[PDB]
Nucleic acid binder design. Sequence first.
RNA 1: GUAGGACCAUG
DNA 2: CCATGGTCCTA
Lengths: 225, 225
Amino acid sequence: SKFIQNAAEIAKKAMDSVDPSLSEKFTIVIRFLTDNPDAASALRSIVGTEEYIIASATNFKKGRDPRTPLPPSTIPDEMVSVILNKYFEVPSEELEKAEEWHRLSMGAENIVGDLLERYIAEVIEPHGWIWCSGSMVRAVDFIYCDSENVWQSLQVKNRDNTENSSSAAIRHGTPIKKWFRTFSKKRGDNWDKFPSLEGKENLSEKGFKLYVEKYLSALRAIKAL
Amino acid sequence: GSKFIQNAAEIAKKAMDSVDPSLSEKFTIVIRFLTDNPDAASALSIVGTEEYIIASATNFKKGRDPRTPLPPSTIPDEMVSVILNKYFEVPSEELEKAEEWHRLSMGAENIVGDLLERYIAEVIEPHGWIWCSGSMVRAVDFIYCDSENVWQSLQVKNRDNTENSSSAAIRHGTPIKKWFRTFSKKRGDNWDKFPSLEGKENLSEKGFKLYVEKYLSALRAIKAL
RNA sequence: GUAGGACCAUG
DNA sequence: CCATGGTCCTA
């Protein structure tokens, strides 16, 4: 639980051995967790230890590397195709295509959340917010140490209709700003309610869409490397 | 926890007589099983009361009425189509179709387990197994009082990759037998491992498919009205 | 605010 | 066999 007393030095040293351009960011995240140890997620070594910090630097770094969308690697249930054909009137000739597009759609649904985090990070990390990449921080996606030396924190989700469990209350800092992008039961988006913070005014759905188009085209372009 | 009223059987018979007299015998036996195993009783009006039994008769009967496959009532996320288009290479002109087929596929998946219970019920209820229709028994789909007057129970699932819990320990009877139909990671079916019980010999994947097809035809004719 | 089912991942 | 996580949907 409680972090080692030289956690900042250990953090800087650890990320310098992994990706020095991330050391300042990683060090600030370790500072946040030192103050808020219950926000640290299990990664294996004990939370707050030197070995934990070192493992976390790899985790944090790997979190930023591009993650490929991937359909499920399961065998589909043939009976689903029977129902599509016999009850929903999908033509026989089209069932193979329907099965594949279903699998790809599930792959897409499973990466939207990661894309949303990357997009926001692109826009607001210039302003000093830090993306808590990887899985070391529980139920916080972005953090910020403001003017008044108070921790500000942000939790983002793609959709309103997710059960929001697995959160323990912050100790040092303001309460976590929580925000979601889309509504399950109505059309449109929720960017107009994005919380007040440095860089908010440069986020939008059209921006998100442009980000995704450019990034996914990039990811296709490196598929063969 | 809660305990069933001493005259639960009589109440059950009287309740189901007014709802559907052909089910009264089956329903009474399920209430007997829950009398013996009150922690298996699913919440709905307190468990085991006269009121509960009467409500349960309607639920048990409604469970046996045809359930209609339905796609989600939600608005799809536009970004899934962008991902399909820019990463998975689904042509623009086919995105609206992919979106619809994905929604039908989820509708279908959401009814295959119900169809699986119905098929099995049609084959093994003539041998004295009783389908716990409706939401009555937690984590149990079929029950049987055998020659030795011992409760036998069975839980059926469509797929092997399902969370395995939320059944209180059985009180009177043998442990719940568990069986699934399909493998998530390999082709084929698991009917050969269906538990030994009267009627098992009359179950098969080819039979399930025939049943699904006929069943959905019946449902099409109901929906047409 | 609370339960349920499906699907897919990791150890 | 165990136990964790995420997405989606329903009531």
